[PDB]
Amino acid sequence: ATRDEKITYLRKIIGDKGSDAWDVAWQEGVTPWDQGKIQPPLRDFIESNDGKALVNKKSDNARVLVPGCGKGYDAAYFASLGYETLGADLSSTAIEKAKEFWAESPELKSGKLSFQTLDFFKFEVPEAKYDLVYDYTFFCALPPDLRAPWGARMRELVRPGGTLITLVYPIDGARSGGPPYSIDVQKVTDALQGSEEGSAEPGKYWTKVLDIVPQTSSPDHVGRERLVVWERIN
Ligand SMILES: Nc1ncnc2c1ncn2[C@@H]1O[C@H](CSCC[C@H](N)C(=O)O)[C@@H](O)[C@H]1O
Ligand SMILES: [Cl-]
């Protein structure tokens, strides 16, 4: 019933079942990541001068992807900003629970917000790709050996000149084990910028336009969190 017990159990069933463990955890109510709401740094970015500018330039058919969305607080938030938004999660249980949690959303009603059981690695990316993608407790949910695929998928998911926001948490140093895996901005950078081979300035696929300590974090997130905004180039 404690967080640690639940984490221990979560990691145990991931060891036995692999990625199938996530729907199992959702069915059994072992969801220690679940916070019931978006993280404050997301709202404060959108409400900042850079965030206002990003939202104001959005095209009329701009699309948002929130992968590993869980109960979907972030997808609901982006939909409320006027974006046609898809919350994608591997667990059909999670997706139903998201549909319940946001049952009264006006954007769920209109179809502007949609929740779908999808594998982030496998689903067919729309032709137009995504204008804006938001990753929170998804990169850190993945085994380390899946970080490179995630970077590659992000590269094809975000249209040129589109934006990926990564709320990088938890930044816990050398702590081993996960999920949540201890991550840092460098690990996200390496995944997103791929293989150098030339060992040069990695800004080939993305420009890291903003990398900040959020001014308001959840109490438990203070000192373990950076918000980073990436723009797709080439
Ligand atoms: N390949 C994959 N594709 C889509 N979702 C995945 C996935 N692997 C794991 N997930 C989902 O990633 C989520 C990690 S838990 C955190 C969920 C959400 N970001 C929140 O902040 O509450 C789980 O819901 C899990 O079902
Ligand atoms: Cl919320």
Side-chain angles (χ1 to χ4, degrees):
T2 64
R3 191 191 130 73
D4 301 309
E5 274 143 65
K6 288 159 64 223
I7 290 295
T8 301
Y9 179 79
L10 179 66
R11 296 178 176 176
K12 197 214 145 43
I13 56 176
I14 285 163
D16 318 329
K17 275 294 253 153
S19 60
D20 294 334
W22 289 101
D23 193 62
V24 174
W26 273 107
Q27 255 168 228
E28 293 179 3
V30 189
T31 57
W33 57 83
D34 191 58
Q35 303 300 314
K37 55 182 154 83
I38 69 171
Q39 290 304 313
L42 171 57
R43 167 179 287 119
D44 292 336
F45 174 71
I46 288 313
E47 288 180 6
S48 77
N49 284 336
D50 288 353
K52 289 190 307 243
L54 174 72
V55 179
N56 294 359
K57 317 318 172 43
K58 88 186 157 49
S59 88
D60 279 71
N61 326 291
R63 281 154 88 93
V64 166
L65 176 79
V66 178
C69 75
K71 264 161 85 212
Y73 317 112
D74 309 297
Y77 181 58
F78 282 111
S80 75
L81 304 167
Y83 281 103
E84 179 174 25
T85 306
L86 171 66
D89 201 285
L90 189 65
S91 159
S92 49
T93 304
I95 292 302
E96 184 48 49
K97 284 208 103 306
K99 287 177 180 183
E100 300 165 44
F101 191 100
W102 294 109
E104 313 153 280
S105 155
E107 286 92 26
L108 195 71
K109 182 185 173 40
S110 75
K112 186 197 266 316
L113 166 67
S114 154
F115 288 116
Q116 291 185 30
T117 307
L118 297 169
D119 190 328
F120 162 82
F121 294 103
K122 306 184 164 165
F123 85 97
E124 172 103 354
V125 68
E127 202 149 284
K129 293 172 184 309
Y130 290 101
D131 301 86
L132 179 58
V133 178
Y134 179 69
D135 188 289
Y136 170 68
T137 43
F138 183 46
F139 183 88
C140 74
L142 289 172
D145 40 282
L146 266 76
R147 290 173 178 159
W150 169 99
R153 201 77 164 106
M154 290 294 188
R155 285 190 297 265
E156 35 163 359
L157 282 167
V158 186
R159 62 147 184 94
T163 287
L164 161 70
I165 305 171
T166 51
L167 188 48
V168 184
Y169 162 89
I171 310 176
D172 289 335
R175 180 182 54 98
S176 204
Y181 281 96
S182 175
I183 59 171
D184 55 47
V185 179
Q186 191 64 59
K187 284 161 175 180
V188 173
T189 308
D190 295 345
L192 286 174
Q193 304 282 31
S195 57
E196 301 308 305
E197 175 188 350
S199 73
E201 287 301 321
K204 26 182 190 263
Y205 295 111
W206 308 88
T207 296
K208 192 174 69 158
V209 302
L210 183 132
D211 180 341
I212 63 157
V213 165
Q215 249 207 273
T216 78
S217 283
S218 298
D220 202 62
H221 288 42
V222 174
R224 319 163 55 210
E225 199 163 65
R226 288 180 82 74
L227 188 146
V228 186
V229 180
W230 311 82
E231 285 184 10
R232 190 71 170 82
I233 63 196
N234 271 4

